[PDB]
Symmetry: C2
Subunit: 321 residues, 2 copies
């Protein structure tokens, strides 16, 4: 029997699929809490397969603890920045990941974050709870909406495209995107215009970041970037925390260089409860719930399970990296 | 000089317009707080024109205090259930209202409220602030989304259509609506299907109430309605508080007859802070911010101002009821 380590309690369908594989011995971290480095090193020892999560840093150390038996890592995420890919490819280890199945949900969460930020729901909710609400008021809790807006998207991949698609009927006048390369075919549906980062910041009323975390994008959204934004604009990040310079953001939000921000990702995760960004009424922070619907999480789980199983058996994977 | 009473501080552009009318004497309630009944009676005495708000109950008593000078009431709202329409038409008084200008913002707000509610943003926000957040967790904060959902809309007028149009690209498979009368032409953009209230509640994953408050709609969303809803379904109201039976809604939410609710309107307004509904983690309440963007509020103000002046001068009004 081949050994499999799962780093967390996962959605049922995925766990059952693993429990059904007669050729597998499945060891599991029986918790909702992230597995410490030390217990993961202990757990992957001798494993033929690792099923892991975003949260788990699979670097050279883990690979070494594994070590030689490891033929397949299967991550329950589309993002891969948590894997030491170069060491993995050197070792001839196969990788499963979960693109496509979370596209709609993540785009959906991204628009929810956009709207609750720019329409100021969190302040509004609190005004109800705290006795601030006394009547309907013509001047009160006004934000900025999407009618005739310009929306700037950083990274026009499947998720960005699906954000643009949900945004269009709110009356968006023009879509801009940036990246390393124009994508006419993907942009055509929205008449998106490929522009530089400086131009994107200058022209947009809304900025949505939906790219991978890479050397080219680390610290991309910094002081120079917020400076170029309109003071009436709203900044949304659903990529990785390290794409944003958090101190520059705070400062931009505190001095009014931009109107508001909504973050689904931060650095680190979790964010400390005493963090400056959390003292700000125009910053909305979500705890990385992009893909959080029942249906989506269940599908991701079954896909991770199936990637792992095909990996173990030397077969084509439903979705391999 | 004709006398004009304004019942609150309104957006600048509207007050500037009034302030430029050399044919007018403009008295204003100098406050963001709602005008008491006694102060309103006092202020309308001798008025030729009344510029009022949704919050203001313009009933027989007010008109009497006015009394005989009053020729024009201008409301900065699309809703009119706060006016004694039959008394007004008997007295030959003209009415201005603000349709159309707030259609896109309101629809925009209703979609924000739907997304914040079904994607559990408020719970999510508090878990970051209260230390609940410890990692990325596969089973945590999962809501229900719109992919292949059925959306049911009560009242498919301009705002309902504009909700439908925003929701379509989130992957809605089926729109249903109810009302007093089918609307083929207005429904055809969405292939929406006219259905009875019981069928609406039975079939929908999301229910959005966007109708006027009338005798036929008071207490419409009650115990039998919530019973017929899917227990996975989400209920949104942007119409008027009195369309819902708040106690039935509370009970439905507490027992799990439905998955969650999001209300932009309540009974009364404001809702008391110790209200049962506000002890529920699966009820989102906003303080009636449907039309709260700077652009829209300013447009509404100018419209209400211009309706008033045209009224005073016996001319066609930009938007008359």
């Amino acid at each position: 029997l081949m050994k499999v380590f799962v780093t967390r309690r996962i959605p049922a369908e995925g766990r059952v699929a693993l429990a059904r594989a007669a050729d597998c011995e499945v060891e599991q971290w029986d918790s909702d809490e992230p597995i410490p480095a030390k217990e993961l090193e202990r757990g992957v020892a001798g494993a033929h397969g690792l099923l892991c999560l975003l949260s788990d840093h699979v670097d050279k150390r883990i690979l070494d603890a594994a070590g030689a038996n490891l033929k397949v890592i299967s991550t329950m995420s589309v993002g891969i920045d948590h894997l030491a890919l170069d060491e993995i490819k050197k070792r001839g280890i196969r990788v499963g990941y979960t693109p496509d199945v979370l596209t709609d949900t993540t785009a959906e969460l991204a628009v929810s974050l956009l709207l609750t930020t720019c329409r100021r729901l969190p302040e509004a909710i609190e005004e109800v709870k705290n006795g601030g609400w006394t009547s309907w008021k013509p001047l009160w809790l006004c934000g900025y909406g999407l009618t005739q807006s310009t929306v700037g998207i950083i990274g026009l991949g499947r998720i960005g495209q699906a954000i643009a698609r949900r945004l269009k009927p709110f009356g968006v006048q023009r879509f801009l995107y940036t990246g390393r390369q124009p994508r006419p075919e993907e942009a055509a549906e929205f008449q998106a215009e490929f522009v530089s980062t400086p131009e994107l910041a200058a022209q947009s009323d809304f900025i949505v970041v939906a790219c991978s975390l890479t050397p080219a994008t680390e610290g991309l959204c910094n002081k120079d970037f917020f400076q170029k934004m309109k003071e009436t604009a709203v900044f949304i990040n659903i990529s990785r925390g390290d794409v944003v310079n958090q101190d520059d953001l705070y400062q931009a939000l505190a001095s009014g260089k931009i109107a508001a921000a909504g973050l689904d990702v931060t650095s680190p995760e979790p964010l400390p409860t005493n963090h400056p960004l959390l003292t700000l009424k125009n910053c909305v922070i979500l705890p990385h719930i992009g893909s959080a619907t029942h249906r989506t999480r269940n599908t991701m789980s079954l896909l991770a399970a199936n990637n792992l199983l095909a990996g173990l058996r030397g077969e084509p994977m439903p979705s391999e990296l």
